[PDB]
């Protein structure tokens, strides 16, 4: 995250960690055995860190749970990122508290406008490296959709939309993919793509979660 603010512990309770040895994305809390992230984030052997702020560091309220399966949507396509989500099962449910906390799902998709936040533990330059440690928050709003596609002229579809500001300076980054963009208490968006950070004309690309929700409950309902 690019010109956020530290969030607070465990301020973000639906907010994932996905590791691999290391963090390597974001993702979202469904409910106490399902997790939605972006399917560019899919590798094996992902563990799911629950009850994180600093994620070098031991500090009491996690919960480490080993992905049982993870699916992929079945439209998606890599080379563009049309369709980018995924969910990941866990080998066991997490046990909910203050802390550790699911995100709803969206009865209907989010008006231009709407304010958002986004979080992460990425990248907080736009211009070099410097990873934070603890989870960074960003409160954005959905863009017009028309200045989606000028930002990015034949590569928006329909299940995707921008967030932040055109003038840049605040905006997701390199390891936030697979993380939410919650709007109205509602995850609206997963942070999916961009052209660098922070960068003028060139705001972050989200997945339009609630074009998804039927296939999000009708797969948790049979896996
Ligand atoms: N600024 C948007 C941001 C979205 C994620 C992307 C990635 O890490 O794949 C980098 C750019
Ligand atoms: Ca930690």
Known sequence: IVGGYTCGA???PYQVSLNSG?????????????????????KSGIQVRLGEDNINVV???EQFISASKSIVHPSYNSNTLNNDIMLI???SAASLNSRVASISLPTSCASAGTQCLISGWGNTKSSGTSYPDVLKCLKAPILSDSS??????GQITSNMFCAGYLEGGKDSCQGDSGG???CSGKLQGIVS???????????????????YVSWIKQTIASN
């Open 148 to 153: 989606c596609k000028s930002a990015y002229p």
């Open 22 to 42: 290391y963090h390597f994305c974001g993702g979202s809390l469904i409910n106490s055995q399902w997790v939605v992230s972006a399917a560019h984030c899919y």
């Open 180 to 182: 939410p963009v919650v």
């Open 10 to 12: 465990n301020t973000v």
């Open 89 to 91: 099962k866990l080998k």
């Open 59 to 61: 500090e009491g309220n």
């Open 193 to 211: 793509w961009g052209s660098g950070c922070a960068q003028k004309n060139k705001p972050g690309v989200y997945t339009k979660v609630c074009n």
